[PDB]
Design a protein around this ligand. Structure first.
Ligand SMILES: [Zn+2]
Ligand SMILES: [Zn+2]
Ligand SMILES: [Zn+2]
Ligand SMILES: [Zn+2]
Lengths: 7, 112
């Protein structure tokens, strides 16, 4: 999955 | 919507030149105008088509589609792999006990 803080 | 910026933030290219220097239409943030090539954004073709039909927000403008809290810069949210809408962990339905390893699909895309 993708998140704001890992993108 | 804000007037789109006609270059990709990531590679600087216009719609005429992605990273491969090939033409590719931009996706643009409705709030700030920042744009990206789908390839530079790392969006799949299916995600790209869906996002082009929506009022898309860039990573910095994205607000939670459930609570729409203005929030703080330090907050985190999941991004849907089908529509790229953002959701706080605490705003996901069904509730998650942990982040999925693979794709995550929001409750707007798959009501359940
Ligand atoms: Zn680009
Ligand atoms: Zn933006
Ligand atoms: Zn929320
Ligand atoms: Zn979705």
């Amino acid at each position: 999955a993708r998140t704001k803080q890992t993108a | 919507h804000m007037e789109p910026i006609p270059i990709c933030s990531f590679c600087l290219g216009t719609k005429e030149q992605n990273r491969e220097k090939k033409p590719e239409e931009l996706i643009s943030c409705a709030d700030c105008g920042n744009s990206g090539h789908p390839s530079c954004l790392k969006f799949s073709p299916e995600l790209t088509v869906r996002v082009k039909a929506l009022r898309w927000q860039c990573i910095e403008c994205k607000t939670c589609s459930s609570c729409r809290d203005q929030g703080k810069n330090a907050d985190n949210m999941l991004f849907c792999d089908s529509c790229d809408r953002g959701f706080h962990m605490e705003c996901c339905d069904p509730p998650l006990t942990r982040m999925p390893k693979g794709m995550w699909i929001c409750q707007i895309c798959r009501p359940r």
